[PDB]
Write a protein that binds this ligand. Sequence first.
Ligand SMILES: [Zn+2]
Length: 273
Amino acid sequence: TFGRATHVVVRALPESLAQQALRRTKGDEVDFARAERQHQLYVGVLGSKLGLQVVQLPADESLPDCVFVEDVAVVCEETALITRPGAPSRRKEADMMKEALEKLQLNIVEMKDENATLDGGDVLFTGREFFVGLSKRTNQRGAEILADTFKDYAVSTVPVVDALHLKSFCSMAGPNLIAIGSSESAQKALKIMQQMSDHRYDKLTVPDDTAANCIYLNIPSKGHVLLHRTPEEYPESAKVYEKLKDHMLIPVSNSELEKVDGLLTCSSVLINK
Ligand SMILES: [Zn+2]
């Protein structure tokens, strides 16, 4: 069953994130304390409320972006691909992720190709196939290694020209539902993805591109669950998600990490055992 998960890997925020974390725009100062509170609430939802077994990795001051675990690992069934981030400063993040996943007894595959780069944020897994964004963080060689690692799934690439990663404007919101931003760029990317697949996906358009990034889970005792941005952050988008009456909607804040280009999917890696 798509979206099913039993465990989730997360990582604590390092003090260095406030001023050293990578960001496309240097503007509003990050409130570290508040960022820690939002992370605590985020982890509380996944672990306490939804009952997932949480694996909490310690923060590393030398790795300002270590909180965004999604970018260093792509998991599909029992196999985990340890990526080679497009950002040199984030490559050491793979060390602790590899150890964590190996402890969970998952088939490990490392991206050692010195000419290949891939960020987990550029990978959209629909449960049926993979869509990989080609951006400044992920290249053709990286997409090729992904396709080789998960041979039982189709892999198609799509240009990411306006955002950091593919998931900066889309994510799965349900079994056959893709949440997508209303921007022309986001809509154009979705058209390309849909044209390459032989399966017709349903789409849920939201006014705020960054609000199109949500976390969908299928919990045995609750059913369809969706973590999305709060009404305070993006009221117009939260209102759209209200249409999903068969989903257990859970508002989750992430305003501080968004300052360093971090969205909801970025802070976790879901695994099903
Ligand atoms: Zn991300």
